[PDB]
Design a protein around this ligand. Structure first.
Ligand code: NA
Length: 121
């Protein structure tokens, strides 16, 4: 059908919008603390602490696989990155501090992406 193509044209555009958004969020992590999943060889107990690990490369794989049906699902993943870090790491650590900053700085980016997704449909 033509209605399944028109969907795929939009999903593809949403994928294209969210790609831009992803790039901007990750620019707020110049230390690349959140770039890759937490190493299970280096932090073997990690899964005892964090049940849903998330990172930017894992969001990217999903994104290029058009796995985000909407902004909300994308935001959920971004929030996991931050919330996982803020649980696993104590307050006086470079990691916890890096998440606070990414949260604060990503907020502005997500604010505008909400309005753009509503605006463009
Ligand atoms: Na903690």
């Amino acid at each position: 059908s033509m209605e399944q193509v028109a969907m795929e044209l939009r999903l593809t555009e949403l994928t294209r919008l969210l790609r831009s958004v992803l790039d901007q969020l990750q620019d707020k992590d110049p230390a690349r603390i959140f770039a890759q999943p937490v190493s299970l060889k280096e932090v073997p107990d990690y899964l005892d602490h964090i049940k849903h690990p998330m990172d930017f490369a894992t969001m990217r794989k999903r994104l290029e696989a058009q796995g985000y049906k909407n902004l909300h699902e994308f935001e959920e993943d971004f929030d996991l990155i931050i919330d996982n870090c803020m649980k696993y790491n104590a307050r006086d650590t470079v990691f916890y501090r890096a998440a606070v900053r990414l949260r604060d700085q990503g907020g502005v980016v997500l604010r505008q992406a909400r309005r753009e997704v509503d605006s463009i449909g």
